[PDB]
Amino acid sequence: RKYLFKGKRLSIFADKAFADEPPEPEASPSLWEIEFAKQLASVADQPFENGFEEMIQWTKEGKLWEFPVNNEAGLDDDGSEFHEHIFLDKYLEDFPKQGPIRLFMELVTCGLSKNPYLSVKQKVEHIEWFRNYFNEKRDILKENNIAFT
Amino acid sequence: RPMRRKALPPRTEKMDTDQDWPSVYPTAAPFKPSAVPLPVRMGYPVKKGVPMAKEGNLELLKIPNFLHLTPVAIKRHCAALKDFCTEWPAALDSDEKCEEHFPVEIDTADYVSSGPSIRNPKARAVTLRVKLSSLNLDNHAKKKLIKLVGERYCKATDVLTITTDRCPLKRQNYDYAVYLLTVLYHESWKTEDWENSK
Amino acid sequence: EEIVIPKKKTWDKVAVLQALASTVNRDPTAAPYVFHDDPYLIPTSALESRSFLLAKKSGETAAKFIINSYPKYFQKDIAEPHIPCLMPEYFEPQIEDVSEAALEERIRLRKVRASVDMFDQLLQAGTTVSLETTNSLLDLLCYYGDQEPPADYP
Amino acid sequence: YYVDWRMLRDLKRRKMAYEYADERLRINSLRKNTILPKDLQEMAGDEIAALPRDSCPVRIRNRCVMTSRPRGVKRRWRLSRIVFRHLADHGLLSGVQRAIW
Amino acid sequence: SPLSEYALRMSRLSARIFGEVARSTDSKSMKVVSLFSEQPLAKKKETYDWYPNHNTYFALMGNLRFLGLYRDEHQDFKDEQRRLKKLRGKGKPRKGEGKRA
Amino acid sequence: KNRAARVRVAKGNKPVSYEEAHAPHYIAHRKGWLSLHTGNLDGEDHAAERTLEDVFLRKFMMGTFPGCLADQIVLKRRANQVDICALVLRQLPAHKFYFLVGYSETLLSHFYKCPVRLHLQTVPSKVVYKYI
Amino acid sequence: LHVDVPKDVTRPTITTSDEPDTLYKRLSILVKAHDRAVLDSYEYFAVLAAKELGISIKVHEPPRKIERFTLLKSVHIFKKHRVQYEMRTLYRCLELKHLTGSTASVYLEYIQRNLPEGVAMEVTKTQIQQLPEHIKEPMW
Ligand SMILES: [Mg+2]
DSSP, X not given: OOOTTSSOOOOSSOOOSXXXXXXXXXXXXXXXXXXXXXXXXXXXXXXXXXXXXXXXXXHHTTOSOXXXXXXXXXXOSTTOOHHHHHOOGGXXXXXXXXXXXXXXXXXXXXXXXXXXXXXXXXXXXXXXXXXXXXXXXXXXXXXXXXXXX | OOOOOOOOOOGGGGOOTTOOHHHHSOSOOOOOTTTOOSOOXXXXXXXXXXXXXXXXXXXXXXXXXXXXXXXXXXXXXXXXHTTTOOOOOTTOOSHHHHHHHOOEEEEEEEEEOSSSBOOOGGGGOEEEEEETTTXXXXXXXXXXXXXXXXXXXXXXXXXXXXXXXXXXSHHHHHHHHHHHHHHHHHHHHSOOGGGGGO | XXXXXXXXXXXXXXXXXXXXXXXXXXXXXXXXXXSOSSTTTSOOSHHHHHHHHHHHHHHHHHHHHHHHHSGGGGOOXXXXXXXXXXXXXXXXXXXXXXXXXXXXXXXXHTOHHHXXXXXXXXXXXXOOOOHHHHHHHHHHHHHXXXXXXXXXXX | OXXXXXXXXXXXXXXXXXXXXXXHHHHHHTTSOSSSOXXXXXXXXXXXXXXXXXXXXXXXXXXXXXXXXXXXXXXXXXXXXXXHHHHHTTTOSTTEEEOOO | OOOOHHHHHHHHHHHHHHTOOOSOOOTGGGHHHHHHHSOXXXXXXXXXXXXXXXXXXXXXXXXXXXXXXXXXXXXHHHHHHHHXXXXXXXXXXXXXXXSOO | OOOTTOOOOOSSOOEEOHHHHSOGGGBTTTBOOSEEXXXXXXXXXXXXXXXXXXXXXXXXXXXXXXXXXXXXXXXXXXXXXXXXXXXXXXXXXXXXXXXXXXXXXXXXXXXXXXXXXXXXXXXXXXXXSEXX | OOSOOOSSOOOOOOEEEEEEOOEXXXXXXXXXXXXXXXXXXXXHHHHHHHHHHTOEEEEEOOOOEEEEEEEESSSSSOTTOXXXXXXXXXXXXXXXXXXXXXXXXXXXXXXXXXXXXXXXXXXXXXXXXXXXXHHHSXXX
């Protein structure tokens, strides 16, 4: 008799041959859409039932460590590569191609390649400091027969 | 006039002997004398005295109890965790069989400690171990490979050990050790004119 | 000859805890987990149930007040990885200059009266305001109906 | 408030040495070698001297974090022998016991 | 024994591969590699964070005591000794009005 | 004579608890450790930081529950979680404990940036091991 | 629960990828603690858990380490009178074998999450992989 899905319908609308044609984020989430979502969450918001459900919520919030333990979780050094940390001679092009300054900077870049506590950006900054230092000391170097830049 | 609240009787009294104990202690919790239906006693006893009772027992509270981990729970836990596991290939039934198809061994270490920081400096280090027999090396190549690596090569086991910890992260140190192997292998095959003067 | 390596299964960070939770059931002899597990602290009646969960929330709000009012004492971060939800919150605008950008901050922070003052000031100067930015102001005002967002404080 | 004025002075020495660590590293590197002209090395010998004295990291002293005691400190806990004994003898240090053998 | 040409040229080929110092460097000049390969003492977390922030603890607990959420038995002890001392007329003099003019 | 952590004999009228009765040389023999972390194990770091955090957490709980603590608190660190287990006298009303638990947990989680939980076992009165 | 039981409990979603899985020849778990009995219970829990998931496990006890240091007993002078303290570290090594990467993550998570207080783990995974494709063929 009172069949839920058998009988006449309004028929104002038609079958959705095309579905969800406009994207859900038509614009950046507005205050109206941001607030309705918060209310939907409260609809199913019930208190913790055991220590598992509490730890699940802490994990979703980042409060509790993820397992298995990864000692480098969230620790990506600018998405670098091993070759960037190890091969640093590209940055010594401005320096003299030979001579005492080249011999010294070779030692500097050798240590920087073996430094696990510095990022590529910090390693480059050590190189740049010496470039500007010797430039300021152009006159003292020239007396010693060393030509810089 | 002031009313002091009365504590309810411990809920252990309402616990049946055929209860579902895993449900009582789902996760690691401190010992609660009102939830553990056992007449447990702990404490060195005074002369003509018995060990102290569970109620108000600091010593039982100081113990890392395993009530949450019981043989009945562990079996019910691992039953759910079976869907996660994947099957080891049957063909690799021996250690020698593994060396045949997968000669390269990469060692990586994790560390678990208690504190706010999950950081350990030792987690970056990586160690690669390969046998020279597994590598396709001519008589010339093997001699050159063994001189370049120095003490990394072990004659007794014929295993080359490359340990890389210079880079900050573990993914960089791992990629570096694989790189070191390629250069050492390819360089060993290359023959230089100065080598004829040995 | 070639060995067949199994295809690795993957799961969410909470998948393992969710699996362990499925095994356990409700303890029939215990009060809800929210309530403290002690005979003295178990809610006897329905009033003490609600009153105990209103004193707990009251202490949580008392702690957040201290943290959000003296933030300099809760700023040292010693947690690796960094936990954003355990840091002090700041809700007052820190952009002093009167620009369309400053108005956008107030709109983001949801201050209604302050944003109206800076929007009118922008009109007084006559500086251009984007239609999108003007709509973000109306959204805040229309949704809150010209009234400051409800909050509780001393 | 820190324990005393001596702990405060040390705290500032530790915060100014952190600021000048890179600088004193780069300049001091120019002197700890035999590859650069002695004229440059003599000049870097003066730039390092010109930096503030509290930048020098050898003026830091390890003091008990709770009592500011200069000597008798244990570096693993940063506590003096006297303060460490109070915590150990009470069971408040995890795993520390008396040594009987 | 001495290193023949084959021995020396192999060592340079190895150092070139393993990113070690390739030239002949004196012990003095090897400190530059050490300085730039090791974190300086002042940059290590133990040095710059040797102390707890004593200002944060003293200020925070003082603020909590005034909000009524923390009780300092020590401070209440001192607060009453000052009250009693002031009644006895031994209280702190005002600045600039000390016994000596 | 050794005076360290010894509750000296009176005339039979001083009620000492199990923890108080035992001198330091019984640590690891008859009585355990009040704090359990991994920072004093061999080849482990951050002993200084765990020990300082404990000292504060003990002074904080005393002031937050003044006169309501029957014995010393027990601190348990697992992963980044901190757990405070305290025997508390039944002096205060029940709802007051719910406030102090919510307050002390939230405040200590935002101060050390770790999840902190408070576990309270209420006793009718202090438990006396022996009268000394 | 006597009469009230869940009907269709929700279970996490485990989707098999198309990437090949890691192959761990060995996986050494060195747990450390001040208390031997805690290691015995964890050894029982871990060995029982390994056996229930099909993992092959072996256990041995590395020699214990005791670190002793001396301090001065008096606050002032009285040099000759000292007090000595010690810390004891005890070890239990769980040597697992022939594990895929999915089996080693779920097992390590399960046993790492249940690591008692005062116990520190030191996992040492040993992966096995083929040779780099460049190394396979010598190229000049
Ligand atoms: Mg000194």
